[model samples]
Target: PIQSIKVDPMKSGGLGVVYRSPDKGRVSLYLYNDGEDILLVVDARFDWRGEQNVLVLNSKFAGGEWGPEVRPEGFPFPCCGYVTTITVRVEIGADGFTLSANGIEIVKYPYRDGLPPPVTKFQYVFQDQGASETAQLESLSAYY
Candidate 1:
């Protein structure tokens, strides 16, 4: 399985994001910048619920340890190793942000994560490399 994205910056920036994992495979992460930095991560893997891969969906947001994990009511994450012309839409409103994946509604995280409006940069990170100035453009397109 593979995941890639586009990031548009309000300012300018990579700050490395590599979380430790054993069975890690696919991931869609959002690093938000309201003022400081608030990270919103959605990782899809085959192990979250046994053999079936899971996501609810993805975008740029997060919660806390022991905090609630929000998944849109009946939405299902595309399974691991699935083929894709992945589509992701991030619509910014005055108060919050909504993320849609492959035309499926995902989540609308609020500024509670810290003003979703001020995100300064974006990237499509894989393993660690595969990153460049172009990653921003690639990540921003609704589909690739």
Candidate 2:
């Protein structure tokens, strides 16, 4: 199920070229590729007058589990802004499929050559735990 997928800025459906959710809560988006890897582009912002915010990007490979990747601290909106963009590259090779993010090279062993195939799906989550919570995701895409 690990396929390649991409999101083009010009071809995004009503899914909102950007996804924004409430603060202190969790919102997510899912993407599917035709047996390839997935690349996600996220843009999040917090209100300048509200509480801090937290954002996370989680993924689950084919027949696998979901977890966190890149996270950024919250900042005051319209004044001190915070934004983070991450790319998830997954591949199935001789040893199985490997997942990595942000070029930090954190490797996760999701599969082994001797295991059964996995379910191909991934999730992106955003959460804010303040009275005035808010977050936005610019786009999510897949590529093979």
Candidate 3:
């Protein structure tokens, strides 16, 4: 199932998100257009920190299977043991998407099926056992 969190259509810009997980969880933000075609999938795991923390990125246009699961060295997650809040930003461009965590660039994902734009909606999803964990979106903002 997918959860729709409404937002204005963005042709090109960046998205800022503040996520909080009280019991460690997974959440993926789906970037797509008005026609229901998926542009990108930004999935993240907050259950693990340090080397274990990973960003699982994918797209329906790019075979649909989760992959290029990236873990840049010294990747920050859970902020601190006492703080479960994670901040991330996604910059969209004609060539690809650049994902950053806590203000550090993590990975630059070029479009597998070419660039898709005018991102109209963001849908939330939970994969595998992710539904069981407690994940919350504290804030989200889009700026071009």
Candidate 4:
């Protein structure tokens, strides 16, 4: 599944993405600037039926190349699966972009080099190799 939503140009804010998917796939969020440039990425590698247990964060340069990846410390251990429903919240801060699952801060990607692009879009990507069930979008919102 692939989806993108337009948002106000953001430097500091947060986004809440609610979704559900089967166990065979993974979901990710991308914060994009104008003309398809990615400002930030949140890769949620879940366990079982989509409880976000591991997270990877990255950013893209204005030159259209990927930056370093940050897999922060202190991710919650994988437990029982969700009803397959989960929420991944991303907060943009001065120091970096912070990600939380169900309000628990799990990882932070510190800004590298300089500031990111002016973000104006949020994209959702569901990746399931050779699988049929697609992730269902429950809700998505951006806050400043």
Candidate 5:
């Protein structure tokens, strides 16, 4: 069960809306940013849906909002699909950003360097709708 929810910007904090399901599955949290990198830290005991977990960070440089990018190595099993406390962090840089699970590098974007600043703002999303039995959001923060 999600104990509490917090966001850097009180307005954006509402993103952690709660949904319920009878079955024991998983829940997802969606996050978004306008012109900064949104860093989300989840500290809970649940199974990660791996590729299922997504972040939609749009760069102004791009024409439209950049949709969720797949995990470079695909969502890990057991680790991303089990009952355990984990911390996930996402940082959007000038050219690109990176995602990590428990401090371990999971995926990276714009593999190459020397890319221009993104024109679009960042957007966060949580998939899975209502598969989780207990969804607990710890904290949400962002940096420009």
Candidate 6:
């Protein structure tokens, strides 16, 4: 199904989450509208940094986050001078979220403090959980 979703560009506040599952597993983009930084939150409510942890970015927050730079190994990285377009793909994960941008794998985060977000109930937050004009979703190409 093609979803017409809206996301708060910048200044969207703490709930800078762009997408989320029914259980709360979410994909956070440009936190607080900062405009360029992206992150993946495995556990929506909490994290495991003090007591336990695994994978590099188990938690995605303003404190510290990273993105895959230089694009893919053989293709040209996307230019963001004024922002032409950016494509984000999300795949359901067991304990967290798996994200990719411009054909590059951004990150793989596993749930640290709680259960991962429910993936089966996926849908666009048309009301801006916290807003896009138009985009094509061709079919999920027939799971997209």
Candidate 3 vs candidate 4, TM-score winner:
4
TM-score of each: 0.51, 0.35, 0.71, 0.78, 0.42, 0.33
- Candidate-wise lDDT, in order: 0.42, 0.38, 0.65, 0.71, 0.36, 0.30
- Among all candidates shown, the one with the greatest TM-score: 4
- For model 1, how does the per-residue alpha-carbon lDDT over 50-120 read when each residue is reduced to its tens digit? 43455533333344332355555423434443323444555554555566665676777654543344464
Per-residue CA lDDT of model 6 for 1-144, tens digit only, reads: 124333433121112113222211112222111322233322211112231111123333344544332211321122221112334455545554555545677665444342233222222221111112222232221022
Candidate order by TM-score, decreasing, is 4, 3, 1, 5, 2, 6
lDDT of 4: 0.71
After superposition, the stretches of candidate 3 with alpha carbons farther than 4 Å from their true spots are: 1-8, 47-52, 61-74, 79-83, 125-133
Candidate 5 — what's its lDDT? 0.36
Rank candidates by lDDT, best first: 4, 3, 1, 2, 5, 6
Error of 6 at 140 (Å): 9.2
Which candidate do you rate higher for lDDT, 4 or 5? Answer: 4
Q: What C-alpha lDDT does candidate 3 achieve relative to the native structure?
A: 0.65
Deviation from native of the Cα of residue 110 in model 1, angstroms: 2.1
The TM-score measured for candidate 1 stands at 0.51
For residues 14-85, could you state the per-residue lDDT of candidate 4 as single tens digits?
A: 888888764445678988777666667877665425435666777765576677777776544335543356
Q: After the best TM-score superposition of candidate 2, give how far the Cα of residue 15 lies from its true spot, in angstroms.
A: 18
Candidate scoring better on lDDT of 3 and 6: 3
Of the candidates shown, which would achieve the greatest lDDT relative to the real structure? 4
Q: How do the residues 1-144 of candidate 3 rate in per-residue lDDT, one tens digit apiece? A: 345655677868877777665335456788877766667777666553432346677766433454454444534655543336677787887778888888788888887654367677776664434334466667777775
